[PDB]
């Protein structure tokens, strides 16, 4: 990936995350937990679906064409017919080969991107109250109960509430 999150500073994925593509894993005084993030997961899913719709889209509705199988050689005209079809097949096979490669390279970059966006979202929520540990985890420098954790996950976390406590812990 271009952002270096998936297969990057995130060491690995979570096989226990079964109701989402991205989510939160925390540890506080009350314990540990894993919860899926809806917005990030949905964003990844929608864009992949867009690819699917555009790809599995258009007809190619053909009837009367040309002969493509021959019992015996005839010469010039048959040569041209065979050459035309073989030329066609190679070009389309090329198109398919490139298309899938392009989509997949883009798909991996999108998903890696959506991972990074989530991390950056939470980073901005936390302000001066936390520090990046380097593995996609934030060390939170104040007491954070389950209600506090949920407020982070659902985006209602107010950094000003814990700022004094957090700054004091960070630098003393």
């Amino acid at each position: 990936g271009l952002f270096g999150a998936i297969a990057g500073f995130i060491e690995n994925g979570w096989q226990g995350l079964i109701d989402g593509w991205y989510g939160f894993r925390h540890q506080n005084a009350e314990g540990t937990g894993t919860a899926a993030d809806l917005k990030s997961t949905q964003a990844a899913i929608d864009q992949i679906n867009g690819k699917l719709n555009r790809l599995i889209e258009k007809t190619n509705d053909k009837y009367h064409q040309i002969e493509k199988e021959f019992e015996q050689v005839e010469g010039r005209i048959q040569d041209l017919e065979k050459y035309v079809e073989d030329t066609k097949i190679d070009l389309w096979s090329y198109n398919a080969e490139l298309l899938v490669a392009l989509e997949n390279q883009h798909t991996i970059d999108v998903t890696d991107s959506e991972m990074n966006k989530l991390f950056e979202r939470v980073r901005r929520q936390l302000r001066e109250n936390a520090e990046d540990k380097g593995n996609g985890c934030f060390e939170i420098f104040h007491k954070c109960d389950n209600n506090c954790i949920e407020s982070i996950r659902n985006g209602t976390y107010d950094h000003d509430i814990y700022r004094d406590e957090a700054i004091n812990n960070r630098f003393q």
Binding site: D46, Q47, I48, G50, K51, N53, R54, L102, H106
Partner: peptide, 14 residues
Amino acid sequence: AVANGTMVKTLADD
């Protein structure tokens, strides 16, 4: 931004 823009296609959106 403008009041009314133009629709385009990408890989992921029609």
